Write a protein that binds this ligand. Structure first.
Ligand SMILES: *[C@@H]1O[C@H](CO)[C@@H](O[C@@H]2O[C@H](CO)[C@@H](O)[C@H](O)[C@H]2NC(C)=O)[C@H](O)[C@H]1NC(C)=O
Ligand SMILES: *[C@@H]1O[C@H](CO)[C@@H](O[C@@H]2O[C@H](CO)[C@@H](O)[C@H](O)[C@H]2NC(C)=O)[C@H](O)[C@H]1NC(C)=O
Ligand SMILES: *[C@@H]1O[C@H](CO)[C@@H](O)[C@H](O)[C@H]1NC(C)=O
Ligand SMILES: *[C@@H]1O[C@H](CO)[C@@H](O)[C@H](O)[C@H]1NC(C)=O
Ligand SMILES: N[C@@H](CCCC[NH3+])C(=O)O
Ligand SMILES: [Zn+2]
Length: 869
């Protein structure tokens, strides 16, 4: 059946017919940034394979005002077309006056027009503030996955690749950028200019990009000769120096490591003021939030440098993983994002081992594990339909899990072989698509005894959840039993590569597992064993018997005898098993004693995290007596290291991150001295009128302290609008989130709604920040629940924005009462609401919360009191 105002639709499927295959777009956009809209024409060189009457492609909010098919053989210029718009599938069918013929090349041509978008999607309008307080406008695209069609009509599936020839018309006040380099710029009649860009290589629609704006750049060349340029508001060209250095080191590494050159003459990276994702891998023109690309030493901290390094690396890696080789469809999106998420590790560990991103990467893995230990989780690879569904596909799973099961795989196979694995894969599908199975098939084949790695990774990508491996030790035999891990089913098995160590030799014993159960014998009775070394593998281990107690003693006697990743891992698994019911809370809490001997910031920081977390559970909930004791326990223990910390920025990355960590905890716990220090720095900074320089590492801290007085918080807010640093602003915003006055918080949320002072793009993060504080957890929940309508105007569901605006304000709940209001709110969301897999997850998570409490609350109380004594 069909629409719009009559007639019927030749196609009842939201996928496009393979019959009409596109080979080339000729695309021309004439935007106006006063008019705030664009006119455009396109020209598509199709090729039919089966004769047909109609031609089917995507379009969304596009007014089409001319449609013609032309002929190469057949019909000279130019037969007219009958345009049929079926919005429910964001499609339009073309009607021909005569059957088309197989095996020949046609030309589809349309003129179309629209206003620039309001969103962060399609061909939208963004603004920024100048050093002089001027507000300026730019026009910009963001297409992944299904918004390419909101800009120009086209065959908008990742498989229909093509060459794109893009022409942009613009006033002289502006520049035009697009994926490719710029051939010529002809001056049109009355002043207006027109830019012609190099025809692209073959590539999917979601990767087309074009921008008009008046940014300035910083250019440089890679050893292999690409012109990397950094782009950003004119008053921000100084923040773009690091982006350049890194881009460069990083593209070099990639071309070498992948052994495949970056195809394009130049690569661009631009800092977009209003930008929803963190960044976008548009071939040859990658877009970034300012916080993901800009860096100013006066204002950007270590973690900052690390973050932007990360994302720059993550995005260059896409030029290969996704760009050059694209997953065939959205179910295997993980192929792009999981592989890119991983390569981050390799390249950054490669080019910047001083960031020690290695000791970090695990966090990626853990944090997903937290989400993959619920029934409401899913497989890395899963089928996808509605645009919305697809948007959901961009999550912690496709990213982190996919990235985690890759580093695990790499461990089993070895870098040498693994690296070889990918150079093959990439080279094989250069400039084309590839399937889920394709990856594995090309990795596992890097006689005649056969790499069956397939079967293995196949159980990983195709079933929900994560494995828990319990081990029993009776002298010299170990009972390895596997199960699905859950946080308080049947029918799951994993070809799960095991690893472990023994007290004696610190040598690594490997051994694969595929049967539900198996046993193994130990060449010498031993003290303790430790499965999953360096935590390089995607599963949990439980130690029944004295297995846990042994390892914990070891930790108190001589922890160095344990891998600092094993140490880090043990801490993870211990605390996770408490939730898993397998353990009692005192055992974990007890491990956390040896921490006064721990110097590995990774482990030390993890440890504290769990401690610091319970404090925040206790605090939200009114639960005074425990939060107050846990506060006292933290200030008391750990006081040595806490007292050692400097209000400077000296030391390695981990060193500075640990400082920020500690000094924060201290001040967040009202530690008399520390907060005096901060309050002083702030009062100097304010009364000196910005002049004083607060070290970037205590910056967020000082600001948030100073934020408690009405004087400060008002100066911080005004200072916010005036800041030329996204990073500072970021930290200021947080600092404004630490106020105790409801109205003050409410203000922020409104200012973020308005989107003038506080960019809408910050609304979720902001909400989330408030929701965490005791004071704001209600304010926040009221607001979302009360404004779901207007919010849904601002953002798509399910954008990461909506997805996070939902969980951010509710996932932290842990009472019966609230679990209802949420449960009931999600029922309510059921019109345009229903349905997001986040609805589920959030509930399951709130429940888990409630449980942990009743199950382990009292146990926490005593443990603390046992210390007081
Ligand atoms: C968008 O339209 C604006 C109209 O505001 C154009 O600017 C006008 O252009 C004509 C011819 O160039 C001039 O006579 C007017 O004086 C301009 N108005 C202003 C405020 O200067 C502009 O050319 C268009 N932009 C593009 C590149 O299409
Ligand atoms: C469209 O894109 C392709 C590349 O994606 C252009 O070139 C071919 O590129 C492949 C892969 O690098 C080379 O092996 C071929 O030698 C290239 N072919 C030719 C004839 O140059 C191709 O030229 C572009 N075609 C269009 C429609 O412009
Ligand atoms: C990181 O890089 C170093 C070389 O700088 C290498 O020795 C190490 O194995 C790498 N780590 C991993 C696990 O990729
Ligand atoms: C662990 O502790 C012992 C006893 O304090 C200490 O002598 C030693 O440095 C540690 N073991 C080694 C040599 O790593
Ligand atoms: N491709 C993006 C994700 C954006 C998804 C929404 N535009 C990335 O590398 O993170
Ligand atoms: Zn990505």
């Amino acid at each position: 059946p069909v629409a719009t105002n009559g007639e019927r639709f030749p196609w009842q499927e939201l996928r496009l017919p393979s019959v009409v295959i596109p080979l080339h777009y000729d695309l021309f956009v004439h935007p106006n940034l006063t008019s705030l809209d664009f006119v455009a024409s396109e020209k598509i060189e199709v090729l039919v394979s089966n004769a047909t009457q109609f031609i089917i492609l995507h379009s969304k909010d596009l007014e089409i005002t001319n449609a013609t098919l032309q002929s190469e053989e057949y019909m000279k210029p130019g037969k007219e077309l009958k345009v049929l718009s079926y919005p429910a599938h964001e499609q339009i069918a073309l009607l021909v006056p005569e059957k088309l013929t197989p095996h020949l090349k046609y030309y589809v041509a349309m003129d179309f027009q629209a206003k620039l978008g309001d969103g962060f999607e399609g061909f939208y309008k963004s603004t920024y503030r100048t050093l002089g307080g001027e507000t300026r406008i730019l026009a910009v695209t963001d297409f992944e996955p299904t918004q390419a069609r909101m800009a120009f009509p086209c065959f908008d599936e990742p498989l229909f690749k093509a060459n794109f020839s893009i022409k942009i018309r613009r006033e002289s006040r502006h520049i035009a950028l697009s994926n490719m380099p710029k051939v010529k710029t002809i001056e049109l009649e009355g002043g207006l200019l027109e830019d012609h860009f190099e025809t692209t290589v073959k590539m999917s629609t979601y990767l087309v990009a074009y921008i008009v704006c008046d940014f300035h750049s910083l250019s440089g060349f890679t050893s292999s000769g690409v012109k990397v340029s950094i782009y950003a508001s004119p008053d921000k060209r100084n923040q773009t120096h690091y982006a350049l250095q890194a881009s460069l080191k990083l593209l070099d590494f990639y071309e070498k490591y992948f052994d495949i050159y970056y195809p394009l003459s130049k690569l661009d990276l631009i800092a977009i003021p209003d930008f929803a994702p963190g960044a976008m891998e548009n071939w040859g023109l990658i877009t970034y939030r300012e916080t993901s690309l800009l860096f100013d030493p006066k204002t950007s901290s270590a973690s900052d440098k690390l973050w932007v390094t990360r994302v720059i690396a993550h995005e260059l890696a896409h030029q290969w993983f996704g760009n050059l080789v694209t997953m065939e469809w959205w179910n295997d999106i993980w192929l792009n994002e999981g592989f890119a998420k991983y390569m981050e590790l390799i390249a950054v560990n490669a080019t910047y081992p001083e960031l020690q991103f290695d000791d970090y990467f695990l966090n990626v893995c853990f944090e997903v594990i937290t989400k993959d230990s619920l029934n409401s989780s899913r497989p890395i690879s899963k089928p996808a339909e509605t645009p919305t569904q697809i948007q959901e596909m961009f999550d912690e799973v496709s990213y982190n899990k996919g990235a985690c099961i890759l580093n695990m795989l790499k461990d089993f196979l070895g870098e040498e072989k693994f690296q070889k694995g990918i150079i093959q894969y990439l080279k094989k599908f250069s400039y084309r698509n590839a399937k889920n199975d394709d990856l594995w098939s090309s990795l596992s084949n890097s006689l005649g005894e056969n790499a069956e790695v397939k079967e293995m990774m196949t159980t990983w990508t195709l079933q929900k959840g994560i494995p828990l491996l319990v081990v029993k030790q009776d002298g010299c035999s170990l009972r390895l039993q596997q199960e699905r891990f859950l946080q308080g089913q049947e029918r799951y098995l994993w070809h799960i590569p095991l690893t472990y160590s023994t007290s004696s030799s610190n040598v690594i014993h490997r051994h694969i597992l595929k049967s539900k159960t198996d046993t193994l014998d130990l060449p010498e009775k031993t003290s303790w064993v430790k499965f999953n070394v360096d935590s390089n593998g995607y599963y949990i281990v439980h130690y029944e018997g004295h297995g846990w107690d042994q390892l914990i003693t070891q930790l108190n006697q001589n922890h160095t005898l344990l891998r600092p990743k094993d140490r880090v891992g043990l801490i993870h698994d211990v605390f996770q098993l408490v939730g898993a019911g397998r353990l009692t809370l005192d055992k974990a809490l007890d491990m956390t004693y040896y921490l006064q001997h721990e110097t590995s910031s990774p482990a030390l920081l993890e440890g504290l995290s769990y401690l610091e977390s319970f404090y925040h559970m206790m605090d939200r909930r009114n639960i005074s007596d425990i939060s107050e004791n846990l506060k006292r326990y933290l200030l008391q223990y750990f006081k040595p290291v806490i007292d050692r910390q400097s209000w400077s920025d000296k030391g390695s990355v981990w060193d500075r991150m640990l400082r920020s960590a500690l000094l924060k905890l201290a001040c967040d716990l009202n530690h008399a001295p520390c907060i005096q220090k901060a309050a002083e720095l702030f009062s100097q900074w304010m009364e000196s009128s910005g002049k004083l320089n607060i070290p970037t590492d205590v910056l967020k801290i000082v600001y948030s302290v100073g934020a408690q007085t009405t004087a400060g918080w008002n100066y911080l807010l005004e200072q916010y609008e005036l800041s030329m640093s996204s990073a500072e602003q970021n930290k200021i915003l947080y600092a404004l989130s630490t106020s105790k006055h409801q109205e003050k918080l409410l203000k922020l949320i409104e200012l973020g709604m308005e989107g003038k002072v506080i960019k809408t793009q910050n609304l979720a993060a902001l909400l989330h920040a408030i929701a965490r504080r005791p004071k704001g957890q209600q304010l926040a929940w009221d607001f979302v629940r009360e404004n779901w309508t207007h919010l849904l105007k601002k953002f798509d569901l399910g954008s990461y924005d909506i997805r996070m605006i939902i969980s951010g304000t509710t996932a932290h709940f842990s009472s019966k009462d609230k679990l209802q209001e949420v449960k009931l709110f999600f029922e309510s969301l059921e019109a345009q609401g229903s349905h997001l897999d986040i609805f589920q997850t959030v509930l399951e998570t709130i429940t888990k919360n409630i449980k942990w409490l009743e199950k382990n609350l009292p146990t926490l109380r005593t443990w603390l009191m046992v210390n007081t004594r």
